Structures are given as C-alpha cells and as structure tokens.
C-alpha cells in the first residue's frame, strides 16, 4: 500500500527542498533527484481534518488530476498531436507519515519571504496519507517574471506557445485547462531558436525568443478519451465564482456562463477566455526590459492589441492558432 515519506524523499532530497508554490490542495517544492531538478506536489488525502479551508480529497477524487497530468506529459512523445508545452510527469506515489520537519523548514522560509495563504502543515499525524506527484522542473512562473521579460516580442512568443499547446491538447484530448492564471505559466531559458509542435499531423515552428513555456496545474482541468470524460465537477462550488479584484476571477464566472454550469461538457471557448486573460496581463501588468520604441516593436504591440480585441470571437485555441492574424 502506501510507502513512507523517506521512500520518495530521502534525506539528501529533503535537504535540498525549497518551496515554490501552493494552493488549497497543498504544497509544491523544488528539489534535485539524480542531479536533475524536479518539482514535487504534495496533496493530503483521505483524512478528516480541514486543510486550507477544504476537506481533503479521497484517492478517487485525486485520480482525475493524476490522469490528466499523465496524458499531457505524454503529448511530448506523440506524433500526430505533439507538444512539449505542458510539463513532464515523472512519478506518482502514495506516502504515509507526518509532514517531514525539513519540509516544514522550507514551508516556513517561503512564509517568511513571500507569505502563505495556507495552514502550516504541522498537524498531520503519522498515519496521514498523501499523494506526491514528481514533475519535470519547468522554470519560473509568468507572474514572478512580470518585470523580467525582454520585450513584447517575448510576449508574442509566449502567447503563441500557449495557444499552440492548448490547440494540440484540444485536438488530441478535447482538453480544457480551466485555471490558466499567470501562476500556471512557467518559463525556462532555452538556446533553441525555434520550438516545434505538430497539430493533426502538420508540424510547425514558433520562434522561442529564448524561452520555453510549460503549462502546469491540472486541478480544474477536463479531457476525454474514447468518450470517457475526466474533470473536476465545480457545479456546487460557491467560492470559486465569487472572487473579485482581478480579471482572473471574472474568467471563472465567464466559463460557467459558457457551459451552463455543466463541467463534463466540452467547451474549448474556456481556453480562449484564459488566453484573453493572459493577453490582458501581457498588455497591462508586465514591465519589459526593452520598451516598444522602434517601429518593429510597435507593430508587434499593435498586433497583440488586435489579438486582445478580437480573440473572444474565436471558438477554441485551435481556431485561434489556425486563423488568427497574430500567428500568420
Ligand atoms: C512553480 C510553482 C507554481 C507558482 O505559481 N505553483 C504551483 C501551484 C500549483 C501547482 N500544481 C502543479 C504545479 C507544478 C507542476 C510542475 C512543475 N514543474 N516545475 C514547477 C512546477 C509546478 N504547481 N505549481
Ligand atoms: Na514543457
């Protein structure tokens, strides 16, 4: 059945853990496994204590995220519909134990420097179960990089990458991400000048501007294979739809409007909505190292503004990728 935490996180691996993110689900750490950076997502399951304001999920309720993470990871190795724009999934374990004190130390450091919205995970007993997902390390989130991007050309690249990856997942998996806020877009440096994707057998390239994008966090995502749908049913969630103070919170309500609160259905317009929210962040909340004070860069800005203005008239990421003038 379950294994002890030390199976997944031997002493040296625990000693190198640094906390990088969080959500109601639990905690995300970066560490090193076999000289390789990885990200570890740790989710409490099956217990009766409140955790970050929700009850813990059952093993059955975590399976959708596991399945989705695996399907999107596989897309990097496929042929007809191929993208590296999600993130690799290396392993999944069920572990048992109280939270390691070294992880608490990392948690404390994050709380001291960035602040946490979570409860300190120090109340779990030695019989507590967790799911531990180990992912390829994907870089730094777009929000944390909001003052670090070179120019609007870099912004165009990121939007193109995101759109393409979403299109390929729509094509292969009838995928909707459903929570693609700017914390869920990771950026990593690449020396590749061009990145490659294949959509329904047709391969294309995207200029990288030195960055490779990875879309993460499939907690709210939906997909299907052979008529079998995997999703998070939020039809009875109150709080998800009553956020304020950021366009992000409007996106939840707009998705609910689009799907009539039926979350099992396929509505790839949700991917469009998130891309619109991301484009909006690109135009309003980023500080580029190079301003748009040359005619060439101005032109890119006008193109992104045109995208912002027109993209909500498209039906899916696939429609955007294949038809929108931004990508031509
Ligand atoms: C970078 C940390 C991020 C900042 O907004 N927060 C979260 C929060 C939820 C979440 N679920 C999965 C991942 C996840 C999955 C794979 C990863 N590879 N490299 C980093 C990864 C993170 N996250 N990350
Ligand atoms: Na990736």
Author numbering: 471 to 798
Lines from the paper:
Haspin is a mitotic protein kinase required for proper cell division by modulating Aurora B kinase localisation and activity as well as histone phosphorylation. Haspin phosphorylates Histone H3 on threonine 3 (H3T3ph) at mitosis leading to the recruitment and clustering of Aurora B to the centromere. Haspin kinase appears essential for mitosis as its depletion or inhibition results in cell death caused by mitotic catastrophe. Haspin has atypical structural features that are unique to this kinase, increasing the likelihood of identifying specific inhibitors that may result in fewer off-target effects.
To guide the design of new inhibitors, we solved a high-resolution crystal structure of an early derivative with Haspin. The inhibitor adopted a planar conformation, positioning the indazole moiety for hydrogen bonds to the hinge region. This orientation resulted in the imidazopyridazine group protruding further in the pocket, interacting with the catalytic lysine Lys511. The amino alkyl side chain decoration tucked beneath the β1 and β242, and occupied the space towards the solvent exposed region of the pocket. However, two compounds (5 and 12) showed strong inhibition of CDK1 (IC50 of 29 and 52 nM, respectively), which could account for the accumulation of cells in G2/M phase. All the compounds tested achieved in-cell Haspin inhibition, with compounds 12 and 21 being the most effective.
